[PDB]
Ligand binder design. Structure first.
Ligand SMILES: Nc1ncnc2c1ncn2[C@@H]1O[C@H](COP(=O)(O)O)[C@@H](O)[C@H]1O
Ligand SMILES: Nc1ncnc2c1ncn2[C@@H]1O[C@H](COP(=O)(O)O)[C@@H](O)[C@H]1O
Lengths: 20, 227, 229, 20
């Protein structure tokens, strides 16, 4: 369950770093 | 017979982490014309999310490598475009499945929001790698599928329904990552979260764990997009 | 295409974890007839070990599901059919590797490191075949593995010091062959022990470009040894 | 490196399981 939250955080994080 | 066999093969494939096998079996179940049960619907969605996700993940790795040697950059483009071609084949199969079977054979409002959100999702995945006129087409179809699913959900589901919540989570991601609008994203997410919290009495024994989890994911997305 | 292009494609494939693409690029490089450099040989080896490894794990999962099907329903038959599908994929992959080894890699080099490397490689993939083979095919796969391992074993003792990573890694896998394939724990523990003890008695032969690798395989030899006792 | 030892140890352990 904390896995899904961690998985989501890492997937959403790539875009913020990729476009900045 | 063949349906029950296919569902078992899909269950075995998922255990063996052979998600292409799992999507193939669940594709056959869908193509048999009948409306998918809730277990079948989940098996199909998990299979293709793993199948498309592997190529999205590979695409992202190559994309970062491309940005970070004339001949090397030329090669990075070709390997990325190879992955992009794979991405489109996967999405087009899934979107065909939705438009010929899942969506039209969907009878109850809940399934319709489920499959319309799926259509928006897989049109969104196309938009992550699309270009030119194709991108503007995918973006329009994605946004339109999400919006239609969103209107049905506001009219038929409680704000804590996990399908309605997960639809809002992805629709906000569509505004953040596909359109360049962090404010709508944050705007949609908070509203969604706030309505669910305002109606915490609607939580049901069957999915309160799922409802709260997606509520937390909306919150996590909100923290990431403002911190 | 061109060799230099294919190695870059193989490198990109590994980063994207698309190892089926990675073996494909490296299989094409191998088929060009020229001797692979150490980087190319490593790129080929990592690719096929991931490719054959994916099916080995899947085969292991389905086999475990079978031996836990108390509910003796149609699931048992379906598990059998799905396991045999994975086994067929496994056999094709190993056969692709053994063809490459026997048509290009093993003949293309006369130095003892390449010979021990590629012979140990042949032993590994004949070992993978024996993990799922049965009947008249397994007795062919097994002794073929032992023969490739055995030849690589002889060359290694005569040209490499006991701390050479390829020589150590051959002892590690040959010892695994005795335990898992030949169901012979005493030799597996013995073979692994002598290889470790020989390297330890010869620690001064460690090299600046491999001590991290030599010691890593030494530690794995120990790990296998304790796990087996 | 410590992961590599974990992968080998877990991989080598499964055979004991299936053989017993
Ligand atoms: N390579 C992959 N393999 C399996 N699942 C993945 C992979 N990449 C992403 N996913 C999943 O797909 C989800 C992406 O959905 P979204 O946020 O709509 O892009 C993530 O939350 C991951 O759990
Ligand atoms: N699915 C897989 N993907 C990548 N590597 C794997 C996979 N399955 C096993 N391996 C590796 O393959 C090796 C097992 O080969 P062996 O030790 O020769 O039996 C170990 O190093 C594992 O970590």
């Amino acid at each position: 369950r904390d896995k899904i939250r961690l998985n989501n955080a890492i997937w959403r994080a790539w875009y913020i770093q990729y476009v900045q | 017979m063949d349906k029950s066999e296919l569902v078992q093969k899909a269950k075995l494939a998922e255990q063996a982490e052979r998600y292409d096998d799992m999507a193939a079996a669940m594709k056959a179940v869908t193509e048999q014309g009948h409306e998918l049960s809730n277990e079948e619907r989940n098996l199909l969605s998990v299979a293709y999310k793993n199948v498309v996700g592997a190529r999205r993940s590979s695409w992202r790795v190559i994309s970062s490598i491309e940005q970070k040697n004339e001949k090397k950059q030329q090669m990075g483009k070709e390997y990325r475009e190879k992955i992009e071609a794979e991405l489109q084949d996967i999405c087009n199969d899934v979107l065909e499945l939705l438009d010929k079977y899942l969506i039209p054979n969907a009878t109850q409002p809940e399934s319709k929001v489920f499959y319309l959100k799926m259509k928006g999702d897989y049109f969104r995945y196309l938009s992550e790698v699309a270009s030119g006129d194709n991108k503007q087409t995918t973006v329009s179809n994605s946004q339109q599928a999400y919006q239609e699913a969103f209107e049905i959900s506001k009219k038929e589901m409680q704000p804590t329904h996990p399908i309605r919540l997960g639809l809002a989570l992805n629709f906000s991601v569509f505004y953040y990552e596909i359109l360049n609008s962090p404010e709508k994203a944050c705007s949609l997410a908070k509203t969604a979260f706030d309505e669910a919290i305002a109606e915490l009495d609607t939580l049901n024994e069957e999915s309160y764990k799922d409802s709260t989890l997606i509520m937390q994911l909306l919150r996590d997305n909100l923290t990431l997009w403002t911190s």
